[PDB]
Amino acid sequence: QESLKHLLPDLSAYSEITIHLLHQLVLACGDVSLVNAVRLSQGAIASARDALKAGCPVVTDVPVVAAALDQTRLAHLGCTVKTLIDDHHDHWQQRLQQIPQGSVLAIGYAPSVLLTACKLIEQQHIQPALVIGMPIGFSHAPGAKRRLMTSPIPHITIQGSLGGGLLAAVTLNALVETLI
Protein backbone atom coordinates (compact mmCIF):
# COMPACT_ATOMS: atom_id res chain seq x y z
CA GLN A 1 0.00 0.00 0.00
CA GLU A 2 1.21 3.48 -0.96
CA SER A 3 -1.41 5.51 0.89
CA LEU A 4 -0.21 8.45 2.97
CA LYS A 5 -3.21 8.10 5.29
CA HIS A 6 -2.14 4.50 5.96
CA LEU A 7 1.47 5.51 6.67
CA LEU A 8 0.65 8.30 9.15
CA PRO A 9 -1.04 7.97 12.56
CA ASP A 10 -4.76 8.56 12.86
CA LEU A 11 -5.26 12.30 12.34
CA SER A 12 -9.04 12.50 12.75
CA ALA A 13 -8.75 14.75 15.83
CA TYR A 14 -7.15 17.45 13.64
CA SER A 15 -8.94 19.81 11.28
CA GLU A 16 -9.09 19.19 7.54
CA ILE A 17 -6.78 22.14 6.81
CA THR A 18 -4.28 20.92 9.43
CA ILE A 19 -4.20 17.42 7.92
CA HIS A 20 -3.64 18.87 4.47
CA LEU A 21 -0.73 20.95 5.78
CA LEU A 22 0.79 17.93 7.53
CA HIS A 23 0.42 15.78 4.43
CA GLN A 24 2.24 18.38 2.30
CA LEU A 25 5.13 18.61 4.76
CA VAL A 26 5.52 14.81 4.89
CA LEU A 27 5.24 14.52 1.10
CA ALA A 28 7.97 17.16 0.73
CA CYS A 29 10.69 15.64 2.90
CA GLY A 30 9.49 12.22 4.10
CA ASP A 31 9.73 12.82 7.87
CA VAL A 32 6.59 11.27 9.32
CA SER A 33 7.55 12.69 12.74
CA LEU A 34 6.49 16.13 11.49
CA VAL A 35 2.95 15.03 12.44
CA ASN A 36 3.92 15.67 16.07
CA ALA A 37 6.72 18.23 15.61
CA VAL A 38 4.68 20.85 13.69
CA ARG A 39 3.17 23.23 16.27
CA LEU A 40 0.35 25.59 15.27
CA SER A 41 -0.81 28.36 17.58
CA GLN A 42 -4.52 28.56 18.21
CA GLY A 43 -5.12 31.42 15.78
CA ALA A 44 -2.59 30.42 13.13
CA ILE A 45 -4.78 28.99 10.34
CA ALA A 46 -7.67 31.45 10.60
CA SER A 47 -5.36 34.46 10.79
CA ALA A 48 -3.27 33.25 7.83
CA ARG A 49 -6.30 32.53 5.64
CA ASP A 50 -7.90 35.92 6.35
CA ALA A 51 -4.61 37.65 5.51
CA LEU A 52 -4.15 35.72 2.26
CA LYS A 53 -7.77 36.30 1.22
CA ALA A 54 -7.12 40.04 1.51
CA GLY A 55 -3.93 39.80 -0.57
CA CYS A 56 -1.52 40.45 2.28
CA PRO A 57 2.18 41.11 1.69
CA VAL A 58 4.37 38.02 1.99
CA VAL A 59 7.94 38.42 3.29
CA THR A 60 10.62 35.73 3.52
CA ASP A 61 13.98 35.91 5.24
CA VAL A 62 16.04 34.62 2.27
CA PRO A 63 15.60 34.26 -1.53
CA VAL A 64 15.48 30.46 -1.73
CA VAL A 65 12.42 30.47 0.55
CA ALA A 66 10.74 32.99 -1.75
CA ALA A 67 11.75 30.99 -4.84
CA ALA A 68 10.01 27.89 -3.46
CA LEU A 69 6.71 29.72 -2.96
CA ASP A 70 3.90 29.14 -5.41
CA GLN A 71 4.10 32.71 -6.64
CA THR A 72 1.41 32.23 -9.30
CA ARG A 73 -1.32 31.44 -6.77
CA LEU A 74 0.00 34.23 -4.54
CA ALA A 75 -0.20 36.83 -7.34
CA HIS A 76 -3.62 35.35 -8.14
CA LEU A 77 -4.61 36.40 -4.58
CA GLY A 78 -2.95 39.83 -4.80
CA CYS A 79 -0.04 39.01 -2.50
CA THR A 80 3.38 40.49 -3.21
CA VAL A 81 6.53 38.57 -2.28
CA LYS A 82 9.60 40.36 -0.90
CA THR A 83 12.74 39.24 0.92
CA LEU A 84 14.63 40.70 3.88
CA ILE A 85 18.10 39.49 2.82
CA ASP A 86 19.18 39.74 -0.82
CA ASP A 87 22.50 37.86 -0.37
CA HIS A 88 24.79 49.79 6.90
CA HIS A 89 21.65 51.04 5.15
CA ASP A 90 18.87 48.73 3.94
CA HIS A 91 20.10 46.12 6.41
CA TRP A 92 17.61 43.31 6.98
CA GLN A 93 16.71 44.60 10.45
CA GLN A 94 15.53 47.89 8.95
CA ARG A 95 13.44 46.02 6.37
CA LEU A 96 12.02 43.86 9.16
CA GLN A 97 11.08 46.91 11.26
CA GLN A 98 9.07 48.15 8.28
CA ILE A 99 7.18 44.89 7.62
CA PRO A 100 3.53 45.85 7.01
CA GLN A 101 0.83 45.03 9.52
CA GLY A 102 -1.03 41.85 8.66
CA SER A 103 1.72 40.44 6.47
CA VAL A 104 2.87 36.80 6.47
CA LEU A 105 6.48 36.38 7.58
CA ALA A 106 8.07 33.10 6.44
CA ILE A 107 11.47 32.38 7.98
CA GLY A 108 13.23 29.34 6.61
CA TYR A 109 16.89 30.06 7.25
CA ALA A 110 18.12 32.54 9.88
CA PRO A 111 17.41 32.17 13.63
CA SER A 112 18.59 35.77 14.15
CA VAL A 113 15.77 37.11 11.96
CA LEU A 114 13.28 35.08 14.00
CA LEU A 115 14.73 36.36 17.28
CA THR A 116 14.54 40.01 16.18
CA ALA A 117 10.99 39.50 14.89
CA CYS A 118 9.87 38.04 18.22
CA LYS A 119 11.41 41.00 20.05
CA LEU A 120 9.71 43.51 17.74
CA ILE A 121 6.43 41.68 18.34
CA GLU A 122 6.79 41.72 22.15
CA GLN A 123 7.49 45.46 21.99
CA GLN A 124 4.44 45.77 19.70
CA HIS A 125 6.33 47.45 16.89
CA ILE A 126 5.28 44.92 14.19
CA GLN A 127 2.14 42.77 13.92
CA PRO A 128 2.22 40.19 11.12
CA ALA A 129 -0.82 38.03 10.54
CA LEU A 130 1.42 34.95 10.68
CA VAL A 131 5.01 34.03 11.43
CA ILE A 132 6.18 30.72 9.99
CA GLY A 133 9.33 30.22 12.00
CA MET A 134 11.31 27.28 10.61
CA PRO A 135 14.97 28.34 10.50
CA ILE A 136 17.82 25.96 9.76
CA GLY A 137 19.37 24.33 12.86
CA PHE A 138 22.13 26.84 13.54
CA SER A 139 23.33 27.29 17.12
CA HIS A 140 20.66 29.88 18.02
CA ALA A 141 17.69 28.13 16.37
CA PRO A 142 16.30 26.27 19.44
CA GLY A 143 16.24 29.52 21.41
CA ALA A 144 14.63 31.47 18.56
CA LYS A 145 11.84 28.93 18.12
CA ARG A 146 11.21 28.82 21.88
CA ARG A 147 10.65 32.59 21.79
CA LEU A 148 8.21 32.09 18.90
CA MET A 149 6.22 29.42 20.82
CA THR A 150 5.43 31.96 23.56
CA SER A 151 4.87 34.87 21.19
CA PRO A 152 1.32 36.27 21.10
CA ILE A 153 1.53 36.46 17.27
CA PRO A 154 -0.21 33.65 15.32
CA HIS A 155 2.51 31.27 14.28
CA ILE A 156 3.59 27.86 12.99
CA THR A 157 6.91 26.29 13.93
CA ILE A 158 8.68 22.93 14.26
CA GLN A 159 9.65 21.47 17.65
CA GLY A 160 11.25 18.06 18.13
CA SER A 161 12.47 17.59 14.56
CA LEU A 162 15.33 18.88 12.44
CA GLY A 163 12.83 20.25 9.90
CA GLY A 164 13.33 23.75 8.55
CA GLY A 165 14.43 25.45 5.35
CA LEU A 166 12.11 25.26 2.33
CA LEU A 167 9.53 23.57 4.55
CA ALA A 168 8.60 27.16 5.43
CA ALA A 169 7.57 27.63 1.80
CA VAL A 170 5.76 24.26 1.72
CA THR A 171 3.78 25.43 4.76
CA LEU A 172 2.60 28.68 3.15
CA ASN A 173 1.96 26.96 -0.19
CA ALA A 174 -0.33 24.46 1.57
CA LEU A 175 -2.32 27.25 3.23
CA VAL A 176 -2.69 28.99 -0.14
CA GLU A 177 -3.87 25.71 -1.71
CA THR A 178 -6.67 25.47 0.89
CA LEU A 179 -7.78 28.88 -0.41
CA ILE A 180 -7.46 28.40 -4.17
* Residue ranges binding a second copy (CB under 8 A): 1-2, 4, 7, 26-33, 64, 67-68, 70, 109-112, 134, 136-140, 158, 161-167, 170
Residue with smaller CB distance to a second copy, 28 or 56: 28
**How far from the centroid of its chain's Cα atoms is residue 31's Cα?**
17
Residue with smaller CB distance to a second copy, 1 or 42: 1
CA atoms within a 13 Å half-sphere pointing along the CA-CB vector of 166: 11
CB of 149 to a second copy, least distance (A): 17
How many of the other CB atoms lie within 10 Å of CB of 142?
12
CB of 136 to a second copy, least distance (A): 5
In single-letter form, the type of residue at position 59 comes to V
Distance of alpha carbon 52 from alpha carbon 149, whole angstroms = 22
Intra-chain end-to-end CA distance of the chain, in Å: 30
Residue with smaller CB distance to a second copy, 2 or 10: 2
Residue with smaller CB distance to a second copy, 50 or 70: 70
| CA 107, 113, 115, 121 torsion-angle sign | negative
CB of 54 to a second copy, least distance (A): 25
CB of 2 to a second copy, least distance (A): 5
